[PDB]
Amino acid sequence: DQICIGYHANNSTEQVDTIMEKNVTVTHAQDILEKTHNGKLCDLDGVKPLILRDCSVAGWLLGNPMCDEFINVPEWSYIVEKANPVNDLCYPGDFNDYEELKHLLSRINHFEKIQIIPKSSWSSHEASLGVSSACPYQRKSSFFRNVVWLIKKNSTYPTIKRSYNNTNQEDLLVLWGIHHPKDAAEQTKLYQNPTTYISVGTSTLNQRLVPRIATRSKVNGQSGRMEFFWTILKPNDAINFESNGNFIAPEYAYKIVKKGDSTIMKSELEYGNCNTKCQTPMGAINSSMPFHNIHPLTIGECPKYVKSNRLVLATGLRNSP
Amino acid sequence: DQICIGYHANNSTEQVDTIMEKNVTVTHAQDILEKTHNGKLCDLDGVKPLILRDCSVAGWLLGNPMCDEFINVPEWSYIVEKANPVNDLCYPGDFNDYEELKHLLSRINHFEKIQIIPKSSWSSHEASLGVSSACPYQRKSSFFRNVVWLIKKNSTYPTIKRSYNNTNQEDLLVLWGIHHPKDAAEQTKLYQNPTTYISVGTSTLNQRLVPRIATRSKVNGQSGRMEFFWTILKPNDAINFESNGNFIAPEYAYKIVKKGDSTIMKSELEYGNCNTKCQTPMGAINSSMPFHNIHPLTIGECPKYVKSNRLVLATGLRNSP
Amino acid sequence: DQICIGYHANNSTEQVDTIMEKNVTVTHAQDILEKTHNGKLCDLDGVKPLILRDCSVAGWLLGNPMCDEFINVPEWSYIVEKANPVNDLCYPGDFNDYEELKHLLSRINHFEKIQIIPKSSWSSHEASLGVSSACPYQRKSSFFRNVVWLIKKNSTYPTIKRSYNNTNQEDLLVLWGIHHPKDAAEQTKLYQNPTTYISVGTSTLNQRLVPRIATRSKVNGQSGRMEFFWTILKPNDAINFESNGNFIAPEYAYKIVKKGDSTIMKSELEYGNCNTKCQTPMGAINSSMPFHNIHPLTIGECPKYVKSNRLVLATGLRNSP
Amino acid sequence: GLFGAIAGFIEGGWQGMVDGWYGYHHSNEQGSGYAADKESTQKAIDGVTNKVNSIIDKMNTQFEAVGREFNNLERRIENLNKKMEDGFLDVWTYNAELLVLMENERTLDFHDSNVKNLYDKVRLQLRDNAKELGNGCFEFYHKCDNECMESVRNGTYDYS
Amino acid sequence: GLFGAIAGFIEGGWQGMVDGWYGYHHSNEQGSGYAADKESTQKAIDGVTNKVNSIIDKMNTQFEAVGREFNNLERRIENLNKKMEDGFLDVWTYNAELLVLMENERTLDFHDSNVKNLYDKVRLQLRDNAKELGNGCFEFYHKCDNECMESVRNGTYDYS
Amino acid sequence: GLFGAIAGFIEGGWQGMVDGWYGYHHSNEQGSGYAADKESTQKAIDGVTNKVNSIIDKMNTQFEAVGREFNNLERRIENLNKKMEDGFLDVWTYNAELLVLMENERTLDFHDSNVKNLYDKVRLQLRDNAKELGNGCFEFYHKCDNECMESVRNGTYDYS
Ligand SMILES: *[C@@H]1O[C@H](CO)[C@@H](O)[C@H](O)[C@H]1NC(C)=O
Ligand SMILES: *[C@@H]1O[C@H](CO)[C@@H](O)[C@H](O)[C@H]1NC(C)=O
Ligand SMILES: *[C@@H]1O[C@H](CO)[C@@H](O)[C@H](O)[C@H]1NC(C)=O
Ligand SMILES: *[C@@H]1O[C@H](CO)[C@@H](O)[C@H](O)[C@H]1NC(C)=O
Ligand SMILES: *[C@@H]1O[C@H](CO)[C@@H](O)[C@H](O)[C@H]1NC(C)=O
Ligand SMILES: *[C@@H]1O[C@H](CO)[C@@H](O)[C@H](O)[C@H]1NC(C)=O
Ligand SMILES: *[C@H]1O[C@H](CO)[C@@H](O)[C@H](O)[C@H]1NC(C)=O
Ligand SMILES: *[C@H]1O[C@H](CO)[C@@H](O)[C@H](O)[C@H]1NC(C)=O
Ligand SMILES: *[C@H]1O[C@H](CO)[C@@H](O)[C@H](O)[C@H]1NC(C)=O
Ligand SMILES: *[C@H]1O[C@H](CO)[C@@H](O)[C@H](O)[C@H]1NC(C)=O
Ligand SMILES: *[C@H]1O[C@H](CO)[C@@H](O)[C@H](O)[C@H]1NC(C)=O
Ligand SMILES: *[C@H]1O[C@H](CO)[C@@H](O)[C@H](O)[C@H]1NC(C)=O
């Protein structure tokens, strides 16, 4: 009679690596690295993200005529933007401290747009003439919808003196711009005054923009340039403007309504009519696993990322061929 | 007769963790993570730090009327500043490249303040009229004590042409400012000249500041703004000034006397009439141990920081219950 | 008769360290840390690097009279510059966004210099009078060779209106400058017009430089300053200039011919008439090994760097004394 | 490997024994059979479960790298932001690759030690009542029926 | 665990033996007593002291993170400066947690191996002059008085 | 150390045996000689070669830190760029120092285990045909000429 001690074998094909040896077959093994994703952009925690589609953050905020879809958006979970949005600054120019603003809007989850200077309150200037062929809407010359390109009235551009006082409880994102024309004739034609300025001030702001008249390469037909500026206006602070020309006045500002964790993501994906916990630019992750190699940059309840093909722990023992 | 081999046991309650098992009781164990600190700000190596208390670095350097305690400070070990110092720029405005300067003063351990332009040498302007209710001293209108707010004399502000040549062996921190008024009347009332400037130059500096006249929100009663600028002046270099108005002239500059390892620390703590080797914002560390979890940012002979509750090595062996 | 099991010994002196014990003698050991380098700057992959020697990147691009060696350089592998090149801006001044440009030229491996505005095409100004004693060539007053210091002709400086359109397939680095004079007399003496400007524009550029007249410390004899600016001009874009004075016009621009991996290295070494795979500031590495402690910053097929005296693996076993 | 039992003095594994990781094959007059050792198997299961969960749980959490925007004249700080994430995510790539290699080697040795200690459990149990055959088997000097065989597995044979 | 001695063929520890980590209990006509093995204890003390000091000393030094000031329009680079220190100090949090776990496991195994080698020291010393009882004790076939017992501990019994 | 063979029940190494890492010394009527065990030596060579290459290969690649230029008013971000590279290159300095220490300790134990398993290979081979002397030698109860001695080394003595 006989008793033998011994160990488990099976027909497992699973190999792992050690320091001393590689491709060792084992009875059981556990894979820790995730490699799968549904391949779509999905609501975070049951709330739809802000997918700008063909518009940029600038295009959206300024109100490019081609971004009407996002005239009054609801609360968002995270911001998705394409690699090179076609609808950015329809009128050529630049947006001052754009990246810092983009970074600010990552940590916001809802705006409310309010009127702060009615378009119809410009009793001494023309307010409905500032349209351009660079910014078409339905084959018709138009302009960024949230700011107003003021023009002289009766061969006179009186000095603008206006302000808005933030009587609300929330911070206020306020946007304005300055028009840099192509030559002196144009300056006279639009603003009368040859030597103009734009002064803007808050508790902390103190600027005086001077437009710049020059010939430059045409972009969407224009040698002129629009240059845009922003500030956060604090509860109970006021913003003051003064200009004798070239002023792209605000009409609408943004009341910061909901704040929270998010950021801007570069992705060419559409919405997936779907719902998730975790998200990469290439796709959303649904699993229990604790590591992945899909994409560096991420948002959501995301298991950790690393750059590797295969991570596999031995759990069982050396299997006998 | 009999001989047995065996091992130590005791009544140790100390548990540690391993990969395979956790809360294993052992006969001896060594704790490596430090968690204690005396809870006070203490002299580094027997030398008192620069504790600004309610003043900021700007307030101190410019000579805010409320920072008189720090009129002529001795050599310091490190700089402590509160989260939001109440005495900063008493007259509202901004300090140009403030953070870069703050960073410069971290690696300094002693200034010597020298007069470079006597206040009484301004024979063609008024030098003792530049006080403001924004900057009170003992219920009386005053101003930053190290710079001079010049004013017109006899309805005339002649063009200032001055300079200081650094005949010393040390580098020199030099501070000046420009006044941005609220309207044209004020400009005339203070400086006569409507169109003014401030040009400043060294071997490497080349600037021309232009003040900015505007209505803006009142801060400490003022719609005007003071904007301050600095430079390091090298041994044997000179600094040149020219202005026909709005010039906040220097009187005092700082001779960099002692350099060395330090930095600015945000802490609400007072001095502890005490002496130490290592320091965090929350407290000073005195021990032999090699790790801690108290606070990220630190200065002194400080054992290393990590974010963890408990680190404990087994030294003895498994204790038998 | 007898059979014994046993292990190898030799007369190896090689010691290694373990966790439990240190300086343990072993029969064999492998050193992994590299510590040697030929001590010279060598061609990368059989192609000579750009060794500026006593010139800086600014001096080279602007065409400082003392950098004639690098008038028309061939394709380079990497850029070497001394700690403090003696030939930088011979005429004192500054180079706008210098570090960003330096960083741009790291990832380039060949320029081709083209004429874009012939020096002899300035029919209404003087183009051959702009020389300075600050910039000597063979004891004779000269100037940066790639830009042109224009001067008034017949007590008149007409408004310059020029442009260049990038009809090439490659991007174009274009350089210009502005002269900041010492006083109004000089301004009249050189440019006639008291109030001058320089406007420059592309698809994306939009600037208007205004010179700054001031007394400042003399450097190489000059209280005046030259300030230089650059842009990349895209294929099919044009650059426009307009000025009524103080304009340091371009003549030559750089066609970006070869792009690729490289960067600027600070080293006091000369060329070694040699050829290598890997390079540090102190010397080039030739070996099979996988780690080193020579110098942090590197380029080439370089085994990894770490800060340690000795790394040695045991391969054999404990040797018996 | 390190402890000489698996693929050593025990030549191979038993395909037939499926109820556990380590165990017994018996042979007597009533027959021959496979049977797991519950305690030894469940010790190892616990250990290896906790080794796994320790690698997962103590990652709390690694670097959480959410993107930034730099522009055409901030190429230096973009490169800096680039290099930071290279360096980090390539530090974890080293950790994780090597951790898994080292712990894969220990886990196999853990199993080798377990089969060895099981062997020695029974050796000490049976004392002089059986001969070691050197291949992991003991041959009894007396009849060992199923009650006897199960008493070896319980740890209750010759309880004194 | 790995070497089968502590909490294995040696069931428990001796509370009574306080002068060292590993040692002897003897029993004869003159009495019974506990006594440490100096060499074995001091080997282990040295080792474990150097293991500790290696974890401490070779940290020379970790990241020394002294703070910076960024302003309202430098939120990107503030975030960058933020994330850097997250990533780093969370890399050391992984190292240190896991180092301690792995070395805690080795230290226990180190002790297990030590008690095993001590057992085998004496087994080889006594050869056929005593019987192994399998619980860590040897029963002598001859009288072993205190001089004899101390000679076992010295390594001097049957010196040949 | 951990496995008790090297510098334990085998007191010392053989200077005379140069053809391999582990092996045999025989002694009989025809003479005495040293001879390596090929298999055991080549197992270890493979292992240790792969341990080395694993430390080298899996570094693919560490941080590749190519320099940047910051100016007089960008001292904060220069310091930031500074501190990043401190922190990183000092993380690898910890990894590498400690990796080498831990694997140096395992490699010695690997060798100790190897000499032990070789000893037990032969013990099981010779069964009751020789006496263990406790110093790593077996004394045969019968004549063992060179053909016999080589048959022990082949693994072919008493092949059944
Ligand atoms: C415009 O200004 C002119 C001055 O020439 C004035 O006479 C005229 O009445 C104004 N026109 C309108 C339409 O109000
Ligand atoms: C440059 O020249 C081409 C003609 O060769 C023209 O089509 C293009 O529009 C020009 N670019 C600009 C910016 O004017
Ligand atoms: C001030 O200037 C006036 C010019 O109206 C001159 O006559 C007068 O004497 C000056 N006043 C003083 C106090 O010097
Ligand atoms: C804004 O309005 C409130 C009155 O509702 C006033 O008290 C406050 O001072 C105003 N803010 C400014 C900057 O003038
Ligand atoms: C320069 O301008 C003057 C005007 O005084 C003109 O008469 C003269 O002919 C011009 N000189 C030359 C050399 O062309
Ligand atoms: C400063 O003064 C010294 C004379 O003491 C002089 O040599 C030096 O050039 C002066 N510096 C400047 C910038 O003028
Ligand atoms: C493991 O490595 C082996 C031999 O080096 C190689 O043949 C194979 O590609 C690897 N395993 C698998 C499943 O590919
Ligand atoms: C260790 O973990 C145990 C069981 O998981 C738990 O009860 C306990 O909280 C831990 N030890 C201590 C002292 O808290
Ligand atoms: C190893 O350390 C020993 C003792 O701590 C010391 O004497 C020696 O300097 C080290 N080895 C060498 C070769 O220097
Ligand atoms: C194990 O087996 C014995 C003998 O066959 C049996 O009587 C008993 O039920 C079992 N005892 C335990 C403690 O499992
Ligand atoms: C150890 O004990 C022996 C026998 O009792 C005693 O004679 C001697 O003094 C000791 N020898 C050594 C080397 O410690
Ligand atoms: C090993 O040795 C035997 C006995 O001396 C010899 O006959 C044979 O050639 C060898 N066999 C093998 C398999 O190496």
Residue numbers in the entry:
A (entry chain A), B (entry chain A), C (entry chain A): 1 to 321
D (entry chain B), E (entry chain B), F (entry chain B): 1 to 160
Study authors write:
However, it has been established for the H1 (1918), H2 (1957) and H3 (1968) pandemic viruses that a change in the binding specificity of the virus membrane glycoprotein, Haemagglutinin (HA), of avian viruses from a preference for α-2,3-linked sialo-saccharides (avian receptor) to a preference for α-2,6-linked sialo-saccharides (human receptor) is a prerequisite for efficient transmission of avian viruses to humans. However, surveillance of human H5 viruses has revealed a number of H5 mutants that show enhanced human receptor binding with HAs that contain other amino acid substitutions in the receptor binding sub-domain. We have carried out structural studies on the HAs of a number of H5 mutants that were isolated from infected humans in Vietnam and Egypt to explain differences in their receptor binding properties. None of the substituted residues in the mutants we have characterised make direct interactions with the receptors; they appear to have their effects by perturbing the biochemical properties of the receptor binding pocket.
